[model samples]
Target: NEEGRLIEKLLGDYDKRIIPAKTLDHIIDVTLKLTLTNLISLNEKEEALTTNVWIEIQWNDYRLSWNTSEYEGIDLVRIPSELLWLPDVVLENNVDGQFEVAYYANVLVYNDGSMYWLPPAIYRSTCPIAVTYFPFDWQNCSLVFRSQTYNAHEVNLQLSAEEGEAVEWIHIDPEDFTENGEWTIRHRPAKKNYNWQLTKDDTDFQEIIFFLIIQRKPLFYIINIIAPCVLISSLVVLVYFLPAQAGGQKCTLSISVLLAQTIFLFLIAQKVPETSLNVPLIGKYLIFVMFVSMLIVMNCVIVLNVSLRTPNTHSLSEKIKHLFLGFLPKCVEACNFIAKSTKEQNDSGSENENWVLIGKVIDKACFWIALLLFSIGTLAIFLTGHFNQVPEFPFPGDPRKYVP
Candidate 1:
């Protein structure tokens, strides 16, 4: 108990203190300078920012000091913060302050009533973020500070610096900066601002703003998300190139590609935000592939139905022979470059063979046509989304001008 006794003897009696005042009028004449340090973390998912800071205030409390000539020259004291009047300044965007009781406010008073309150608090403030650009996006978030009990006219809060000087005094130790694997810090600056005009009743509303600009490093997501979808998109076209004689399992390949595309849609849904403001490129591309895949499945069905037709089941009209047997084969560059003989007859041996040969030729032509469509569709979809992406990342005024 010797340490406690020594502290008590040194601090003297708080009950007899004459400078401690509960009033807020004289506090307005005093200026409060704030300094933030020790940025613990920026929680993006929850929209919270945590930091440690010192709120500095000075006043002429002549009664709270001791001269070095008095009491064996004991000029300094460690009195309780509750023994003195304190400011009501608080973080405007604080999200988790009520649960934590502040038991760390301690101050040092000089012989001339000059003192500093170094609370070194951990503040968890709310910062709203937009996830529209997401993986390839950057965010600009702020921490706002204001007086909870006193108006701006009563207590003026300023960034810690000399008058007429601009500085980002909210300090973060570079050696202690915590690296975020998902995001990288791009820019951070502190600003002082007022929220009203001379005509407004609350014209004195003041705030200290700290802006954090962070950008995402999308390599991890690109490898896992984008690469897989691209491969799936390319595979969707391979079904059209498969030979007709490749067996019943030929159709199985299309269904597999469809299912893979479906899985990719689920993956995209899980990673990105649920919003209709803009359709993700990956989702649009997947939908395009899925639509084409469904058509591929339907084309195979039509091919099988028409190719398996016999003279008894159905008869091929002149239009059918002219289109598939004449025009389409030439388009796909099939072996049957010329039209079928015009001397075509009944369901004889060579006649049946001609019908079967037409089916394979139609399949080949369909394959080539579908492949061409796939390339065109991919390019169109990508260009549309690529243009969209350019606008979304940089926005209208805030262009991300990267250096080569």
Candidate 2:
């Protein structure tokens, strides 16, 4: 019963409502460290990141010290949090308004008054999603912690340290951390911020903000969404390659590709936050392909009209024949013009054949043009996203360099 006797003596005149320090002037240095266990999800629509973490809070409570020699060599004791003065820290930007830990676990008290509390919590913090690159994007999400009842003068919040050296980042135990399927942690740095409220009569606040910069695993989207979209878009080029006799089929193909691109836009819209600040890179590429598909439809209609023309419906002018058969055929190297020229020389040659020849020339020109446009568009948009550079440091300057 020696441990029981120690607890009784410690709580004899203990007041949990007051600060654990012997004097009000003594500023309690509370060091906090977090170990991320799992990233549950980063909800892009809601702009929130949910993570499971173990939070370590350490401080010296002068009133809780005990002489280990007096209690059968008991140097440490596990005491209920309800019996001791706690520095109540809370998540500042919590989404669900639950600022406290999921459970009030036991606090460890050492013989020299060092108190350590490790509490596990599921935190849903507000994260502003930057969808400029999307699917291939990276996010900088933060969990900000501040003491609820203490001001800057009463408590000094600090990043935890080891052997007097400050730890610069969040502790992710390799054995305990379960990697998220869709996201990978890039950098997780911790910072202590001091904000002075000048207008509020010199009131100041201290906070510890943990930044988790994570990059998305784009393989899923590439396989499911992007690859299919690119394939469907490439079909637009085929609209030009179809024979003039199959003009109706070209229209069908182009319209079908346009519809597919629209469906993809809807799918991407559902995955990203509804913000007009910037369009996602994949969304931009989809829009470009859709525009090209629409243009192809219009081109198909024009080519169809020219191919279906007759001597009665429309008369061919010398200027048009010279441009289509004379000028363009040579430029695009349409060697099939030899057969058309031979047909024109026959006794039974008709003016309607000139219109068909013009349509073929237009088709040849459009085939190369569409292929070129699609190639340029695909390369420009995706390459920009592929080479998106992540910042060297989380903030403007290295915070660890200024750490005291």
Candidate 3:
């Protein structure tokens, strides 16, 4: 009955449409604190970050204060939020049009008129994606908030502090936070921004920006997408390992690798955002491997063409012998096979076998060349991605020393 009487007495003369200050000239100071509860999802394709958070807003309403001793030592009371004047603080860069919290819980008011309202919300904010080092990349996403109805002159928004120490980052309770499986939050810092430019109408120029610097947990992609792609691409080098007599099988193997590369590229395209600004690290490697596979198919064609030639169909030119037998054999260590084949041709006077020897020389040279190219591509592309570092600070030229 005491609580009921207290609520009715407070609302009897309360005006929700007007500000709760003692005078019209007084600027209301609203302190805000954000507690990140969970990262529900970060959609790469949609370029949005969905997070669950508790928004704590505190302010003083001079009209709601009462003497606790007169009210049977009741120091705190709960009142419906609809009966009080609420701050218009809202997410400024939200992807969805919904601007209010999911539920308007009761406000906790103390005897001294200090009001604390903690509301839960699932906010979907716009986040611009940078796919340059994707899968091994870190992103800096921000959630900006500002008072929608009040100008800078009417309201002062500030970050909450604990015992005079300002909270410089998002508050994460160890027991409440649920970790995202795909993303690891690296750094989370909150900053209050002010507009320096002077304007006739100050408007809602001041805002609080919360930055989430998150890194991808790449083990999933490495095992599911990248590892399989690398293994399939490595099979292209073996195309030249098969004997010239099995040219049909060589063609089949090279084509299969090429198709597999194409399929992997399609899979990568589905994961990364469709942006032309920069290609992802894995994408570049996939393209490189695909190109090498294509070259192998072309090389197989040339080797097969040379292998099918006979002395009657197409005579072996002296220039071809000098290039394949003399120069290329030494470079690829095919000299032993070439020398033995030449000796047999000389003894039996069979010009037909020389064409087959030249095809064998081409196959051996191509095998080594493919291996070299693949090694260079794999090392260059992935090593650069592996070494891509997350910056020391989330914002450029930030003077504050980063603690983590």
Best by lDDT: 3
Best prediction by TM-score: 2
Instruction: Please rank every candidate by TM-score, starting with the best.
Output: 2, 3, 1
Q: Model 3, stretches more than 4 Å misplaced?
A: 195-200, 246-248, 328-349, 399-404
lDDT tens per residue, model 1, 1-404: 33355456435655532324446444333444545454566666566767565655554454566555645555455556776655555666778754222454766766666656666567787766565445566667766766565564455566654456544544545676566666665666666778766422252477677666666667887799866777776776676455555475557888888888888777777666544666555566667788888988888777666666777667778887887676752666553443333234433545566677777887777887888888898777656544433223322455542211
All candidates: TM-score: 0.67, 0.91, 0.90
| Candidate 2 Cα errors over 4 Å, as ranges | 197-204, 246-248, 329-349, 399-404
Q: Which tens-of-lDDT digit does each residue in 175-235 have in candidate 3?
A: 8677899888888888889776755247557889889998888999999998899999988
lDDT of the structure predicted as candidate 2: 0.84
Task: List candidate 1 segments past 4 Å from native.
Answer: 1-84, 94-105, 108-124, 162-164, 197-204, 245-248, 275-289, 299-314, 325-404
lDDT of each: 0.62, 0.84, 0.84
Higher-ranked by TM-score: 1 or 3: 3
Per-residue lDDT for 1-404 in model 2, tens only? Answer: 78888888889999999877667577889999888888999998888899998899999988888888767898889998877888888898988989899988999999899999999999999999898997788999899998887776677789888888788688788797788999988778787876755322222367888999899989989999999999999978987768777435878888888888888888877776776689888888888988888888999999999988876567778888888887763465566787677776552345657777789899988888889999999999999888876676667665443222
* By lDDT: ranked, best first: 3, 2, 1
Task: Specify the poorest-scoring 10-residue window by lDDT in model 2.
Answer: 196-205
